Amino acid sequence: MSAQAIIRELGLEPHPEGGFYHQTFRDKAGGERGHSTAIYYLLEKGVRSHWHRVTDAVEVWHYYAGAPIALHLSQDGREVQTFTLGPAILEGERPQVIVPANCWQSAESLGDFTLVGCTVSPGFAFSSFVMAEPGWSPGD
Amino acid sequence: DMSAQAIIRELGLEPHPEGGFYHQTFRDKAGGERGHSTAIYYLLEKGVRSHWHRVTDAVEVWHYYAGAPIALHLSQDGREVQTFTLGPAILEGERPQVIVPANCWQSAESLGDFTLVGCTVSPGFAFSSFVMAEPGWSPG
C-alpha cells in the first residue's frame, strides 16, 4: 500500500526469479509435492520477474493489489503473448491468467509495485524450475 | 485529430457482418481462389463493437493503426478466454500486433472513440469460413 510494508507484513523474501515471495500453502495430499501450492508474489518498479518456466505444472497468476502487471508468455520460446494482469476489466485487463505447463514466462509491474498470488497445481518444486540465461529473450 | 466518419469516408468502409466498418484491400492472386492471403481495413467506435465470431480455417492477425487501443478477446475452445490490449503503448502492456489462431473464437471493442486496424488472414479469408456465435452468447 507502500510495498516495503507489504513485504514485512507478509514476510516476503527474494525469489530466485526476482521480486519477493512467500509460500502460504502446499497441500498435504497429492504426494510429496502436494496437489497444489500457493504463494504471495510482489514486483516493484525495476525489480521484475525474469524468464523462467515450471516444466511440469500449470501456474495461475492472480492480481491482488497495486498497479497492473505486464505478463509475457512464450510456449515455444519464439512467439510471445503479452497480457495486462489487472482489475480494470473494461480496459483490456484481466486479474487472472493461466500459464500452461512448461511455458516460458516473465513479468514486470507497470507501476510502483504489484502484489499477486500464484497457484501451481502439481505443487511447485524447484526441481521443475528453470530460468533462461540472463539477457535471453524468446527467439535468442 | 480524426473522426470515425472521416475514416469511414476516406477509406470507403462499409458495415461488417460482425459489427464495425471494413473494406477489403487485398486478395493474393496466388494460392488458389482464396489467395495465399487477404488484408482488410477495419474500424470500431465507442459503442459499436465486434461480436463473437471465428475464421474456421485460417489464422487472422490484428494490426493497430490509429485511435484508442482495443480489447481483443480470444477463446480457442469456447471456455478458456484470454484478453489482449491491442495498441501502441508497448511499455504499458500493449502490443500493436496480435495473432488469433485458426478456428479460435474472437471479439473486440474500442477503448475510446475509435480504433482503425488492419487484419491479415493468411489461408485467405472467405465468408464460407466465417461463423458467428448466437447474439448474447459468451464462451462457457
Domain extent for B31: 1-140
**Chain A residues near residue B95 by CB distance under 8 angstroms:** 82
Entry resolution (Å): 2.5
CA A82, CA A86: separation in Å to the nearest integer? Answer: 13
Beta-strand ranges (E) seen in chain A are 13-14, 20-26, 37-44, 49-54, 59-66, 69-74, 81-85, 96-99, 104-109, 113-120, 129-131
B86 to chain A: which residues are within 8 Å by CB? Answer: 92
Judged by DSSP in three states, B15 sits in strand
Q: Are B96 and B72 within 8 A, CB to CB?
A: no
Count other Cβ atoms within 10 Å, centred on residue A116.
Answer: 25
CATH of the domain at A106: 2.60.120.10
Residue of B nearest to A99 (CA): B82
The beta-carbon neighbor of B93 closest among A82, A90, A98 is A82
Q: How many domains would you assign to chain A?
A: 1
Contacts of A11 (CB under 8 A, 6+ apart): A22
Residue B22 β-bridge partners: B14, B42
Backbone φ and ψ for B20, nearest 5 degrees, come out as 85, -175
Asked if A91 lies within 8 A of B84 by C-beta distance, the reply is: no
**Element (H or E) spanning B84, and its range?**
strand B82-86
Q: Grid coordinates 467506435 are at which residue?
A: B45
**Element at B120 (helix H, strand E):** strand B114-121
